């Protein structure tokens, strides 16, 4: 059968194509969210068959309710126990296959659905088209992307096809416990839908619209409305039963968390269906006839019924990239169906259109729900084809000249998009495994990670941890990796928890990294009890603007972190303009916006760009390898030679600038540093070498050894200096300069000479007060306890 060919094309696309992106230096799950499923499944396996509904290990120190549904958590736990892969690489490997299998198995609900609406010829082209559609639906259905989005699609389509299947038989009255199986199944698919995704109750209004229209159009649409209703009664009843055990895991009403709201929706829907059943009974008996409403009686009762329900609730080429030609060939199918039932007038066909339009109406312009169109574009293309085909069945091979216009360029994109997989890069993954091993209390974190936390009534106040804990602060993107790989507790989440802001002084990631002095940062860090900071080159460069926007509240305020551009004039002179409007026409402009003076004062710049130089309470403890392009350059470029580094960077920039693309991030950092030295570095300001650095850097928040004592006028400032060497055998200078008060000075130093960290100082501190210079060595305990040290100068 043709249901084995596409099934192989789908395996080829989802398991085979990205195989080496998933099975590399580690087993590497995609994106961020699959790492959190992983976190949940591991914990659920341990506490089987119980699972948590709140996670104090994330959104530190408040904790996060878990909206991720039980379907995938249990599916993955069950898979794990079955293959006795309960943690680590083995678990991940198993979990990696789950979305691929889910995406291959999507053949079944699609075939079923487009068979139940149309015929078999269409249902086969259908199963083939869904096996090759591209876009979000494929990207989230690939090896390693173990997330619930494939299952939203799978159970939604399943729910439709199984529901329509339960309307194509229950007719008349044969019902019995063999015919009862058909709606019970459909109720299960709905149940599983909501259990995959909490917002999935939305399928309930959709199906109820099927009944609404089958009633108010009982004129020119036939349907066994009594059985259509009875089936819905059973279906919605069953779905509610399946949902029921999970209804009470969130303290309130929610459309996303597992709350009794969803239960109300499914029970209410069962009641509505029963009202419809009764409406039909009154119709059939002649009640509307006797009260003199005639044939308008029933639709009016329906109009009124919904009004009340409404009442007591009242109070483009992207498309080609995302669907290929299945977009067009699915768009024609819509219209053809919008005309055909507009002539032949059937119920299943009407149901499908309603589903499609509701999809369109609700998910228009919302890129995050694109995957829902996949099944739509596959069914209405299998129809558009299973119509052109049945027109011509040398004509009998023009059928192939459009059946190639469809299948061909959408296998192409599907093959080209299926060959790369995402997830953390090696620098990040190694940094976090390092963190797990080299920061304190690892054993406790490992035990606690596996505990069945109780669900609390609120998370507005700091959670009460069962032990002495600390937080790890980084941009919110990285939260799932930090938790799943480092087994440490991130301040911020890919659910967008813990971002905070500056305008309302809410301590969080954005208010830490865009903080314009160390004191404010310290305020934020103290509130969130942070002990480690993790910063990456993306935070330093491309994502910096995003942190500014969140911190400030809007786009124009964030723009104060940026200046102009470097360029070459048409006479070939190098220049900087604070604004592009100062740039002579016909210049070549490096399409990289240079940060303003303000940027260089932010924590993100002090940490990632200046390697923590100037700061009192932070020290680098580890960095990863370089960004790829600079690792690659270094085989011909000496990274200790500023001139060669800079000339390489500018060349790359100008080169890319004519393709209109911006430099690689490592080059951007080199240019940022160059800009600083040329525009903003003051007479005695913090110096920085023009050189690349580790993609990922880890810092420790630290009290700092207090060095203090007396000077001798005219000395108005005391400076401290030390050379630091990273585990990548890169050096930079730590500097701090302190203003004198009443013939005395005070300085807080964060580096010690006996810490077990791979980033260490290689000289003692050289203090300098005017003419007198000294040479201090600091010990870890002095730094850890904030001991005071007397030194006369
Ligand atoms: Zn997701």
UniProtKB/Swiss-Prot annotation:
GO terms for molecular function: metal ion binding; oligosaccharyl transferase activity. This is Dolichyl-phosphooligosaccharide-protein glycotransferase 3. Changing residue 67 to E: Complete loss of catalytic activity. Residues 118-119, 171-181, 221-223, 286-294, 339-346 are cytoplasmic. Changing residue 148 to E: Complete loss of catalytic activity. The record marks 33, 543 as: Interacts with target acceptor peptide in protein substrate. The gene is aglB3. Belongs to the STT3 family. Oligosaccharyl transferase (OST) that catalyzes the initial transfer of a defined glycan (a glucose-linked heptasaccharide composed of 3 Glc, 2 Man, 2 Gal and a sulfate for A.fulgidus AglB-L) from the lipid carrier dolichol-monophosphate to an asparagine residue within an Asn-X-Ser/Thr consensus motif in nascent polypeptide chains, the first step in protein N-glycosylation.
């Amino acid at each position: 059968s043709v249901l084995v060919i596409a099934a192989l094309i789908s395996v080829k696309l989802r398991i085979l194509n990205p195989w080496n992106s998933v099975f590399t230096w580690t087993v590497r799950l995609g994106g961020n969210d699959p790492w959190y499923y992983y976190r949940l499944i591991e914990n659920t396996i341990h506490n089987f068959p119980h699972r948590i509904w709140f996670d104090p290990f994330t959104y530190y120190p408040y904790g996060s309710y878990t909206h991720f549904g039980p379907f995938l958590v249990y599916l993955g736990s069950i898979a794990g126990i079955i293959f006795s892969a309960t943690s680590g690489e083995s678990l991940r490997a198993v979990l990696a296959f789950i979305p691929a299998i889910g995406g291959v198995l999507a053949i079944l609900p699609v075939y079923l659905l487009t068979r139940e609406v149309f015929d078999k010829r269409a249902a086969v082209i259908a199963a083939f088209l869904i096996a090759i559609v591209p876009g979000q639906f494929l990207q989230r259905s690939i090896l390693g992307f173990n997330d619930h989005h494939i299952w939203e699609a799978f159970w939604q389509v399943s729910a439709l096809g199984t529901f329509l299947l339960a309307y194509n038989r229950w007719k008349g009255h044969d019902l019995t416990a063999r015919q009862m199986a058909y709606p019970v199944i459909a109720g299960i698919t709905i149940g599983l839908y909501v259990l995959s995704w909490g917002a999935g109750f939305i399928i309930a209004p959709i199906i109820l619209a099927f009944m609404f229209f089958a009633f108010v159009l009982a004129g020119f649409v036939n349907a066994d409305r009594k059985n259509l209703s009875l089936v819905a009664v059973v279906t919605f009843a069953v779905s509610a039963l399946i949902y029921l055990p999970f209804a009470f895991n969130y303290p309130g009403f929610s459309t996303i968390f597992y709350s009794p709201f969803q239960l109300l929706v499914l029970l209410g829907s069962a009641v509505i269906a029963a009202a419809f059943y009764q409406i039909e009974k009154w119709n059939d008996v002649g009640f509307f006839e006797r009260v003199g409403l005639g044939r308008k009686g029933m639709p009016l009762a329906v109009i009124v019924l919904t009004a009340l329900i409404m009442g007591l609730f009242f109070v483009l080429t992207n498309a080609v990239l995302h669907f290929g030609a299945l977009f067009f060939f699915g768009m024609a199918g819509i219209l053809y169906s919008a005309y055909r039932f507009l002539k032949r007038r059937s119920f299943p066909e009407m149901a499908l259109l309603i589903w499609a339009i509701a999809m369109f109406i609700a998910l228009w312009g919302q890129n995050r729900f694109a995957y829902y169109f996949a099944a739509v574009s596959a069914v209405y293309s299998a129809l558009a084809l299973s119509v052109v085909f049945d027109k011509l069945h040398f004509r009998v091979a023009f059928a192939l000249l459009i059946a190639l216009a469809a299948i061909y360029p959408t296998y192409i994109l599907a093959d080209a998009q299926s060959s790369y997989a995402g997830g953390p890069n090696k620098q990040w993954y190694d940094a976090l495994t390092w963190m797990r091993e080299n920061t304190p209390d690892g054993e406790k974190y490992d035990e606690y990670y596996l505990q069945l936390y109780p669900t609390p009534q609120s998370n507005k106040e700091p959670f009460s941890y069962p032990f002495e804990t600390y937080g790890v602060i980084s941009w919110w993107d990285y939260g799932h990796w930090i938790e799943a790989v480092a087994h440490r507790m991130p301040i911020a989440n890919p659910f967008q928890a813990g971002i905070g802001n500056k305008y309302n002084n809410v301590p969080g990631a954005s208010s830490f990294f865009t903080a314009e002095n160390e004191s404010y940062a310290e305020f934020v860090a103290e509130k969130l009890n942070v002990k480690y900071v993790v910063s990456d080159i993306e935070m330093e460069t491309g994502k910096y603007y995003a942190m500014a926007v969140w911190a400030e509240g809007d786009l124009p305020l964030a723009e104060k972190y940026y200046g102009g551009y470097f360029y070459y004039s048409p006479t070939g002179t190098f220049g900087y303009a604070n604004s592009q409007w100062d740039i002579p026409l016909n210049s070549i402009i490096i399409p990289l916006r240079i940060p303003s003076e303000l940027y260089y004062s932010t924590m993100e710049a002090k940490l990632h760009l200046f390697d923590g130089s100037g700061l009192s309470h932070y020290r680098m403890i580890y960095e990863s390898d370089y960004p790829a392009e600079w690792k690659s350059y270094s085989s011909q470029v000496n990274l200790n030679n500023e001139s060669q580094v800079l000339q390489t960077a500018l060349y790359e920039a100008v080169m890319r600038a004519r393709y209109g693309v911006s430099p690689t991030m490592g080059t951007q950092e080199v240019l940022y540093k160059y800009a600083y030295t040329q525009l903003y570095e003051k007479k005695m300001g913090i110096p920085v070498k023009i050189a690349p650095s580790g993609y990922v850097k880890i810092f420790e928040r630290v009290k700092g050894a207090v060095v203090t004592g007396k000077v001798s006028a005219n000395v108005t400032e005391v400076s401290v200096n030390a050379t630091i060497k990273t585990n990548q055998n890169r050096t930079f200078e730590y500097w701090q300069t302190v203003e004198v008060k009443n013939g005395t000075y005070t300085v807080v130093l964060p580096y010690s000479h006996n810490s077990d960290y791979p980033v260490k100082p290689i000289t003692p501190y050289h203090i300098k007060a005017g003419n007198v210079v000294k040479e201090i060595t600091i010990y870890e305990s002095q730094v850890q306890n904030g001991e005071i040290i007397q030194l006369d100068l």
